[PDB]
Design a protein around this ligand. Structure first.
Ligand SMILES: CC(C)C[C@H](N)P(=O)(O)O
Ligand SMILES: CC(C)C[C@H](N)P(=O)(O)O
Ligand SMILES: [Zn+2]
Ligand SMILES: [Zn+2]
Ligand SMILES: [Zn+2]
Ligand SMILES: [Zn+2]
Ligand SMILES: [Zn+2]
Ligand SMILES: [Zn+2]
Ligand SMILES: [Zn+2]
Lengths: 484, 484, 161
């Protein structure tokens, strides 16, 4: 069995009938108008994101799925902050591919729909499913471009989507399999497979100790699982001495909260508390695959946050790499503790920019949910580059404030230089960002709180229910544009 | 007796000693150098917002309070989105006036500190206290400009500050006194006092019924306190037919939650659930006092949300003025219910702009706290005007997303056209804003969720602990600039 | 028959009041067969019957309570003993003074499901022209908090004493 996905646009006012894409009309012409005739017989027009299946139209394609693409000239929607045409394509193609898979068809050719990269993204992201640990699995589908004219664009989409899917795999995998060491080894193999101009160092606890990363170590000690500090280098610039861009990611492989233990309900989702590490590392792997002409460094402190007879205790005071003391009032505000040391270490590379990502606060989820990643930055130039990249990818970002108003609430501390939780519950994501800022002196730093976009139910049409791997594509796009 | 407040700046690198303002140096000369001498003897220099008191320097001023103003040329802070110099002045003058009041002095003269409007704002906002119901009260202080050169600017500051204090009084007053009827009567007397070019309509229940405002009526019926729909007009434009700007404010005089009853802790603060109505009505009163050349209409639905044998019941379906049905899944999401009807009615005036304010969600507090008012708008032009105005006033605003992503979660409704609570618990402020949007078709609409700025502890230096009346001055400034 | 029960249960409580429920059941039963009788008993009858337990629940709300009594006389022998069906008809359950939590309280509009299922079954039995006598009983009211609602610890007297 071989399937075919074809697109059709919504009818414009002066048109007599809705228009097929170039590929759609070519196929219609090939079958002497039978595609149009059957679509007409089937009833109401196909709206954006909807699908309909026609059988036996051609010997090579027993199953043809037509998908609605919406308005043909849909461009950048100033109200939604994204390119609507691309989002329509990703949604439609994903829907069409899911139908092909339900029919248990192993291979499908996909209409480029006027934007091969967007089409490929919808197909690859849409078909993804983490099922390594199940006996019963859906049929494996091999999606390929229909035609031979937009090969580069199609493959670019496959590459961007594959980067996001690696992130999703890492996030979804249960914590007993996805340990700090396993995560580091998987990232290592993918980066090396991407380019030979790479270096990876899986730093052990002894190195972490030598580096005086006391804040990170305090979180790790409660668990029996060994911690590691992942450091990756991609040497893409023609000039070896060119200052690198540095990415930092929160790698808590499992967050139980520690002594300040979490409630039971849905705690399983905390296996994805290493999402910041997953997204930044995956973006670097993709940049390496594309061979972007830039130097990039990735840093990811990795460990578990568990309760035991040697775990962090509320009230304990720990010393960060930069000498600042931190009062650990709540052991479950552990992300900011491991990031304090990683951010400090990031300055040693004399980077052009420092960008960190973390599933940092439940407050961010209460704030924006899965609508957009929250971005706190001291550089409007940096905010604008991230914003522009998100418009292209559809994986949106939204700016959040970095004000002294919030800093004041974390430096007001009984025992130390800074407290790991604010004096109030208000503005949880903002006080968390203020805490991170006390460990940053760089002029171009951006903190991405991705807690709200950790998962997908049905919000992003082209992602099945599960860990989302967002905003991997936005980081890749940012890197591509920066390199140009 | 009379007190005196004088300013001094932080010393600049090239300067030999910190410099007094023009008024401070004049006073020093008047007392033959005794002020500089005593300040030197007293020790460490005065930093921004700090104060020090000197006695017996002059027969007419037994107590002189010197206040730190910070850097003289501090202008717009690109990281904080406000004019820092003005904020420094407001804080310093407020601290100085509080010291004079603690000394029980009834009159104080205030140094204009290079910006008489900011000085007056610091004095008038800083001294304010709602103490009508207390037997023991602080001395009533009469603040006046030291000198006469900048009297016009001083008077302007007193006006802006008085507008905010009216909002504070309305918000702070207990609900058994500040009923829908009382609120309307106070606004009425203040508006007529401000200008004869005004009209006030205190609409009774019978009018609300004739207007088919079923959503608003459903919230009010649970209580025995009569509801009113306050409608005010300010006819400032030279052209009577010039389209007006319309303001709408949530007026819940007390929110117990109704059948979906609230928890007891701090429920007393719900007496300020009419803050949206207070801020927009006070801004209009001030605009009228300023004699701005524009037409403005203010709309404020007012009622209590109480449990009883005839109160809204979860699952009930009500019909809004536009004919759209609403499923009331949670009776405590009452603000969006009353606003639905007010927003529909706002369109009948064929306005240029529609701006509503409301203490709408606890989620907004979790999102940004008291750092800034959240602004949801379909117009980037409108966002920029509000943002620019906020830089001047110091009472900050921060943009929040108005995406279909959030709309989808409120139109997914079991029984009606729209549900009063989202399908999920994430992004509460965003889903609430989406709900409001279903009752708006205007191209220039802005929704201000002021729940997080309802109160002040000590975040804003120049406001004592209590209801804040934010962001009244930002609305007044927006109106002033719009008229120019 | 099942869909009628679904409609009654799904309809919001501000529309599906004790009075409205009784009126819908009435029109459907009379439509089903002429061998029927419908009694929409008011509060005064409930009081005469000394139904103190039922009355204690209803008083907290301003919505009038009713005791719905329906008969289907299908047996050839008029004196044949009937089968009696009884259904709980709480049109909305807020819990009263022992108030419920907010989450999903909207579903309590279906707390009259017992009344809906037995009354609809009787309507259907009548449509089928079954040769039996049947009586349906449905006490209907809301359970709301107020200044005159049932108070924990209160003692009430049922019809049997
Ligand atoms: C819900 C989730 C994003 C919470 C963070 N892992 P925390 O417990 O470190 O705040
Ligand atoms: C805390 C406060 C802002 C809650 C609103 N009054 P709601 O109960 O109407 O959401
Ligand atoms: Zn995982
Ligand atoms: Zn945690
Ligand atoms: Zn965490
Ligand atoms: Zn009040
Ligand atoms: Zn409420
Ligand atoms: Zn409210
Ligand atoms: Zn019902």
């Amino acid at each position: 069995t071989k399937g075919l996905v074809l697109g059709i646009y919504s009818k414009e006012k002066e048109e007599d009938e809705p228009q097929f894409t170039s590929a759609g009309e070519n196929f219609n012409k090939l079958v002497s108008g039978k595609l149009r005739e059957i679509l007409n017989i089937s009833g109401p027009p196909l709206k954006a994101g909807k699908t309909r299946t026609f059988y036996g139209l051609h010997e090579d394609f027993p199953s043809v799925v037509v998908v609605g693409l919406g308005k043909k000239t849909a461009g950048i929607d100033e109200q939604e902050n994204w390119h609507e045409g691309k989002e329509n394509i990703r949604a439609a193609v994903a829907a069409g591919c899911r139908q092909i898979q339900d029919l248990e068809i192993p291979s499908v050719e996909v209409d480029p729909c006027g934007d091969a990269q967007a089409a490929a993204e919808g197909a690859v992201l849409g078909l993804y499913e983490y099922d390594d640990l199940k006996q019963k699995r859906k049929v494996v589908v091999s999606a390929k471009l229909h035609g031979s004219e937009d090969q580069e664009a199609w493959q670019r989409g496959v590459l961007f989507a594959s980067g996001q899917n690696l992130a999703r795999r890492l996030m979804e995998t249960p914590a007993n399999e996805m340990t700090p060491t396993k995560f580091a080894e998987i990232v290592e193999e993918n980066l090396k497979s991407a380019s030979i101009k790479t270096d990876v160092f899986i730093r052990p606890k002894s190195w972490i100790e030598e580096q005086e990363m006391g804040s990170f170590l305090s979180v790790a000690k409660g668990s029996e699982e060994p911690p590691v500090f992942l450091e990756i280098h991609y040497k893409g610039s023609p000039n070896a001495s060119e200052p690198p861009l540095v990415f930092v990611g929160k790698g808590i492989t499992f967050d139980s909260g520690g002594i300040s233990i979490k409630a039971a309900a849905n705690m399983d989702l905390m296996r994805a508390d290493m999402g910041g590490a997953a997204t930044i590392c995956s973006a670097i792997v993709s940049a390496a695959k594309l061979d972007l002409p830039i130097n990039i460094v990735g840093l990811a402190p990795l460990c578990e946050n568990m309760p035991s007879g040697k775990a962090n205790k509320p009230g304990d005071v720990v010393r960060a790499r930069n000498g600042k003391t931190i009062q650990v009032d709540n052991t479950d505000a552990e992300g900011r503790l491991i990031l304090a040391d990683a951010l400090c270490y990031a300055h040693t590379f004399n980077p052009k920019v420092i960008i960190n990502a973390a599933t940092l606060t439940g407050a961010m989820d209460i704030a924006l949910g899965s609508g957009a990643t929250g971005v706190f930055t001291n550089s409007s130039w940096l905010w604008n580059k991230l914003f522009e990249a998100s418009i292209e990818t559809g994986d949106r970002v939204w700016r959040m404030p970095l004000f002294e108003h919030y800093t004041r609430q974390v430096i007001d501390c009984q025992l130390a230089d800074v407290n790991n939780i604010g004096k109030y519950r208000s503005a949880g994501a903002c006080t968390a960002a203020a805490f991170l800022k006390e460990f940053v002196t760089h002029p171009k730093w951006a903190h991405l709180d991705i807690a709200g976009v950790m998962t997908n139910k049905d919000e992003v049409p082209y992602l099945r229910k599960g860990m989302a791997g967002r905003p991997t594509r936005t980081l890749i796009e940012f890197l591509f544009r920066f390199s140009q």
